[model samples]
Target: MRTGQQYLESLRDGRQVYVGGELIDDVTTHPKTSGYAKAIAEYYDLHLDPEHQDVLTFVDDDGVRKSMHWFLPRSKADAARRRAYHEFWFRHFQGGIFTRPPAGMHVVMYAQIDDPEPWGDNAVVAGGRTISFADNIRSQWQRVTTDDVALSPMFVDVQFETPMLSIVEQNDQGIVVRGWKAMGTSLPFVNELLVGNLWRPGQTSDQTVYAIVPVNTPGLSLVCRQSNATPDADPYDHPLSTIGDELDGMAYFDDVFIPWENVQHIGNPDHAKWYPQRQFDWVHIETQIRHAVHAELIVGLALLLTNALGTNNNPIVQSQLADLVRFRETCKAFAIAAEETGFTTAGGLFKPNNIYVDLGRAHYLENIHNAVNQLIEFCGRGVVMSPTKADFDHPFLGPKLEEALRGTSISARDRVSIFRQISERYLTQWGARHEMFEKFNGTPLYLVRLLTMQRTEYQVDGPLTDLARQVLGFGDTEALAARAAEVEKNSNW
Candidate 1:
């Protein structure tokens, strides 16, 4: 495993990129990008710490000590360990940073499976080597010492603009892919990008292709959106503003050549279907659980701020906090339930129940918006009205601003700093837009499809149909109902 310093050093190499219309020579030095990179480096550092080593590092089948994701979980304990590893990093980095890498990881693990020969000989390869492929990717991630090898998975390729992984030509050495992927998050940090789709083979040519290539590979380019304005502003006033910088980019591959070895899934459309077919629900559940944890932190912090401001006694404030807690607990309960009812695939990997996981994720996503809004509302207008450290250094206005904004219990300077930090993390940080992005990140349409896919499992039919056949509407409906019912038989007076 790479040390934190080693990770930082890896990013020293210059990569061509544009942010806010100006070309950046080094991303490590850029203010908007540096904090996130530092946070990731800190995560690396955790792996090396002696106290955290046990939980942070795992031994693979080959006896190599690798990071948590290096091995697929074979038991419930292993899954718990994986969750712990994610939580450790997230607790320190706050939100957004924790959610980013898992997106690509989910795609690679669940979505791309082009070979189906071993079990079914269809697009989805069953039981042959899912764990091996995951291990290979995990090893690749572990071995990456430079920022140039960041991994990204291609998912959405817009229609008309480009083909979605259509194979225009192939050679003995490699295949030439002529298409674009719509959302490639982490492209800025990664050196190479993996391309694939969820669509099946016969559904369209778009889903059958899967390949990895260097970010700077010939014929490939990234067109990303402008940086958010919130990260540059005062942190207090724009608590959720910094969340926008994490938006994905559209990756164009005119004629990118992908070597054969890196081709994990190709031509076998079943591999493309595996992600959505099997792993979608499991990944969704994991993501929601993570989100619930983050939400817990946010609510706890908000409660602290509310109490510090002496607003805890207010009925409205109390109700809002209760609402937040209720939503958070519900989400947490769903996560736990999913874990309790875990299912194992034939591939020797255990996954949480997909239907429940999806429902939980959807609920969490919807409720987070309300929770954030309540936070902003209860905090008052002054939430965004914060002076910077430099502004506080000013001779005349600094003292005046401090004196005016001071809370009752805390000192003026301390209050300002606390609010500023909270604002920066929740509102103005580079990846703060995650709060909004996650609300519909799964794509509302796709979420609908997911929910509908399992209608038979969770619809009115299961219980209602059983009741209709077994007990409802018979000639002796009243007599049978009375016989089935034992109303007030054991009531205590």
Candidate 2:
């Protein structure tokens, strides 16, 4: 795996990334994005540390050390290990976690299978062997895994303006792509960008193509949203935003060339549309696992305020705090249960139960509003109106702040520190983004759970009383179907 220093240097590949309408030549040194890149580098350094080996890295079949996330799970323990890998970093990166870095490789896994499109037949000539599309993706994924490459995804396409029109030109050598895509998060620090459609694919008009290539590819330019981080903002003042404030970006593809090897094809429109559904089988569990950390953060923020403000003893506030705990533990329980029991994939991948993962994700999203509202209710206006760090530090204002800002049991400085950090999640633009992020991140809560129900088995021991009596040999099986048929004949809507 690559070292942290190596990762830092790799960010300078001359990719065209613009923030606030000016080109950012160096992401690791740029005032707007450097801290986020630093946090990612620090996490990479954790992978290299000897003490974290058990949680961050694993020994594969050939005695090769690999990132735990890249290792496919074959058992419950492996799934648990994967969850640990995510939670450790979720806290490590704070609220500004890297936006779906390894997701591109997951996309390539299914996208490489293009039925009747001859994707496998026309092979990638690597290692002096003719490799199928699947092998090509695996080869690249391994290279990325070993190199510890960061992926910034450009999967969702914008409207008619940024149409992402495609198949404009194709040759024996490769295809030339055109048009643009919106919202490639974390572009400044990533190794590659994976481009694909997450919505309905149009064979006749829309781009309907998928490919992964290095971010430094010629002709691809990134325009980003305004930088959210204020350079050198005090960690005590704006902890979450200062750590990882990388925001939304759009990618412009200008006659970009993609070698046949890097692209995947799904010939049928129906298959094209469900490309993201195939993605669910790989990423949904991980999403919930990250969400578990988010849920944990929610509870932590609430309790921090209540404790610091000396409101824990108040009966009403105690009730409010317990409500946040229940929301957290419920989501946490779903994550734990999802991994313990599961379903098998056609690819032989060990998958967490879809019902549990989606249910957990939806639960957290469904009630995140309540969680934030509870935080504001507990923290109160002091978080928003507290004297600035500047005021607390000044010789004149410091003593005045000490008199007015001191909590019932806490020091003025300490109370401000706690609320400032908590405020970043509920009282600032950072807080607002959190609300929007949870609302629209992957899939909506309503839709995700509805599909979960649609796909669920809904039986563990095959239902309880009346239906199970016959299966347990407590009743006759011969008469059941005939009686149901009789009901079908007798009843009408």
- Return the top candidate by TM-score: 2
Give the deviation of candidate 2 from the true structure as CA RMSD. 5.0
Local accuracy by lDDT, each model: 0.60, 0.69
Q: Each model's TM-score, in the order given?
A: 0.80, 0.85
lDDT by residue (1-493, candidate 2, tens digit) is: 7777888899888889888898897988988888778876776777879999988888876578977656776667776777777777666656434535443234234323323134444323222434245555656565666666766557666665345646566666667777777666667777877676665534443356666767888988888877877667777677677676756778888888888677654223444555556664456676677777776777787787788888889999889878888887888899889988875555555667867887888888878787877787787788668767788888987898898888778899888777777677767875576567557766687788666555525423334345777566554344666777889999995
Q: For model 1, how does the per-residue alpha-carbon lDDT over 240-315 read when each residue is reduced to its tens digit?
A: 4443345356777778787655555555655555454453454465576677787787688778778778898989
